[PDB]
């Protein structure tokens, strides 16, 4: 079914939510070095919470997709915005896609 | 289950539009450094009053994502509106997630 | 109950408005010294004035969040304006939550 | 009780609007020593005016929230501002605070 | 009564917009000294023709609000400006709150 | 009684309006000299139209007000726009004023 | 009658929005000597154009309040402005007091 | 009668519309002489094909108001633009004018 | 009749349409030799397409108003700009002349 | 008739929609010499396509007005410009011609 | 028929909305040899996956319509966007042209 | 047919949504090297997974118009902007190609 794909939506909204918002502050003004490592650990644990709530084949989708960073290297305010956006995309078009193909499913069953 | 997420929401409600206000506040001018060290501790103690209107699973959850500030060091601007906007994201996410979600099992058990 | 929360209401109105009116001033213009110290005692009798119209649970909430100004130094325009925006989203998440709480207890109980 | 808070209504709309004009000609343009001295004096009289017009009790909190000036210095522009921008803050949560505590009021006993 | 207070509404609502408008061509653009001169002349006969029309409770209030100038020194554009701010403030204020005032009377009287 | 005050109510609109449009006029741009003693003839001209127009209370009411220029001297930009802004929110004022006055007494007779 | 005021209606509206129209274009742009010279020759002219669609009883009011320009000299851009804007305004004014007035006696006439 | 002013509506319309048009050119940006000696010349042939369609008594108050361009003299941009305006205005104003005036007519043969 | 004076509407509309847009294209942005040379050949050859649509009536009175350009010198973009003005001023009167007179003759016939 | 003027509307929409869409193109930015060279290939290859797509009268017409480029010269963006906006004219005012002057004739076979 | 002149109406979309967000993409910012060089050879593949999707007839219509780019030359930004707005507006011409008609001819239909 | 070509629409929805924010976040702000060659290999991974969810024809139109990025070189702003942008105007393209498409399909076999 389409709608075992998304265990937790409550989380996955929860958690995403909260992606969303800090690269809308990263997007806001420049970052220092303190920040930029804190967000590091921040994606990284991000991404576990993520695949909590979600079913295992969106697991592995998401693990092809996305890369933990170096943790011997502060990655740049660019890298960050590129890692949270990745997430956000995927996290909006997850839900919008999911919710589009079930509402044509039904659509096709009416006839 | 669900709505036993939130102990208590007024309290969250409370306590989250605070955060959300400072961090306009921040992002509006340039703080200082007394400034910046009375924010690191509203902020050690927003954390603490929201844990006590949690579920303890949330709880856990906040823990593992959030990181209180050494407090031998007053944080910059940059990282105190990254501390602010991770709360703000994930508190708006979690209240919308769960009606959200909840909306979606009442839709259907209609069917 | 939750409407035993606020013990004063229009009180408390009252004193939010001052403050929040007061924090608009602060933005719009740089302050001086004796308006800074002005506006520090003001801050503290607004937080007495806030605790005298609220049940002895948030008093100590309150309290708990907030801190009077060191009487030996006038503080910053920053300082004054943090202190405020603590104040003014505390108290808009108050009510609102307590408001958006007491609506969901009714719906609740309408099934 | 309640709207026994405020014996003179119409007076206290009176004196309260004209510190409101005047608060937003202060923040126009900038001021010379004559206008501040006389805006200084104003302000004096008006809290007089505003005390005729108040309950006890709210006489008092009056008396309690404010400072009247030094009559041996002239007060700043800002100095100014904060002084009146406290009370049309407090005046307009005054009446707020009475309308939106009794609305409840009457909205609880129709259940 | 609260109706027996101005005594003269069309007058007073004459002399008020003349002052208003008098208050919106000074702002526009600066005063020389013979306009000056001359809009203290005014202002001195406006709070003559005001209290023509109001009730003596009135005129007493008006004349403890306000102070004719050194006829030995005319004034500047800002004490004109706060000069006349304050009588518009005040009149606007005195329509508003007896209307206001007297609407709540009537809606108690229902009832 | 109270349309017994403005005889000629047609004429004084049209000598208004003619005013009015005069003031707009010098706002937008510089005058010379042969353009202000043009319009100090014109001020003085008006104010006697007008004169033809009210009744007698009225005349006396502009004349304690207005002052005509001395002959001798070309007037200012400011103390023509000041002069002309005078009778234009007087003018205004005194119609309003009227029609207003006049709604609350039709409205009084009702109940 | 009010009405016998204006004795050719359509030929005063023609000469006056022509009036009104050339006082556009010398608002939008300086003009030269012979335009100055030519409009000094177009006012006069329309003055008397004016006079003939009007009752006598105006002509006389026309004629008190304007000038026309010494023929041995060419009148400023400023000049020229005032003259037609005194035009345009009286003219609106002549239209808008008839109807107005009218309108009124027509209101009073229904009681 | 009235109607009968306009001989040939659709001609003066058309003729209008184009001088009109030819304002709205001049305007918009710099012309060179050949740009003036041509419109020097579409104004005298205007005219004439504009009297055309006008009744004897029109011609003659066209006749009088304007004036033709001295051939031997390629005459300015804001002559030009004078010549055309007057004759816009007058032209819009004529037509408005006779629509005005018949309905005020028919309306008073109503009552 | 009115109607017999464009004998091929849709062609007249299809070569002011193209006038019109040429005109738009080059008051955008400033010509070179070889388009203002291209033009000019383009507005000769329009003034015939158009007379080809219309009565002789109207060929003889645009033959009347316009003028090709000299065979041998290249006008400027202000000379072609005032020449096709004068082309879509003339067109768009012409069609709305004739609605609205037709409009009107059957308004008065319907009486 | 009338219809029958476009033999392939579809067509000359898709080949006029195109000349368009350059049109737009060419005017956002400085083309380079490659650009232009092929611009006016596309350019004669367009006029060909359309011909296709029209009556006789239309492609004579059309032949009348346009005008193809030298082969051994690469035209001016201006130049461009002017070509394209003539085609893109005369087809708009072709089609709203022909539906304009269709509509014209079924709405007088109503009557 | 004129709509078997789209074999593949959905795979022509495709196409075409992906090269009308190239075109896009390429008016927003500078671009470089390498991305120059990869559009290039898009633009190649584009028009043959057009082909794939049409009739012969436009087939052919294309081919004499486009040009493939010399392969041992990498043609600017100018000659890229020239080459895209030329199939941008040719496809957008090509559908709205066939829709028009088809409705077109099926309002003829219904008389 | 023609919804047999997706065989995984939430799938492309997810992957397609989340390259056209990572277009966005591209567009918004310049790259650094390690931003880059984290994107080229998103890129790649995209694809891939975009693949997955199409039909054979697809895979191969996808094959056909693509290029990935040479391993041994990080791709520029530029390349990178251009080849995200050529997947979401093809992923737009082809569902909104296929909606109307069958659109059509539904509304031809009702009649």
Redesign the interface.
Same mark, same amino acid.
């Given at each position: 079914s389409?709608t075992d794909?998304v265990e937790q939506?409550?989380?996955?909204?929860?958690?995403?939510?909260?992606?969303?918002?800090?690269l809308? /502050?990263? !997007?806001? =003004?420049?970052?220092?070095e303190?920040?930029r490592n804190?967000?590091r650990?921040?994606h990284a644990?991000?991404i576990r919470?993520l695949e909590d709530g979600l079913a295992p084949e969106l697991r592995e989708?998401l693990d092809?997709?996305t890369?933990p960073f170096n943790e011997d290297a502060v990655?740049?305010d660019? /890298?960050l !915005?590129? =890692?949270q956006?990745?997430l956000?995309?995927?996290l909006?078009?997850?839900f919008?896609?999911?919710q589009?193909?079930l509402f044509?499913q039904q659509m096709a069953a009416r006839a």
């Open positions: 389409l794909l939506p409550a989380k996955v909204m929860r958690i995403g939510t909260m992606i969303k918002q800090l809308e /502050e990263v !997007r806001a =003004a420049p970052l220092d303190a920040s804190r967000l650990d921040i644990t991000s919470e989708e092809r997709l890369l990655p740049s660019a /890298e !915005r590129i =890692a956006a990745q956000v995309g995927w909006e078009g997850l919008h896609g999911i589009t193909a044509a």
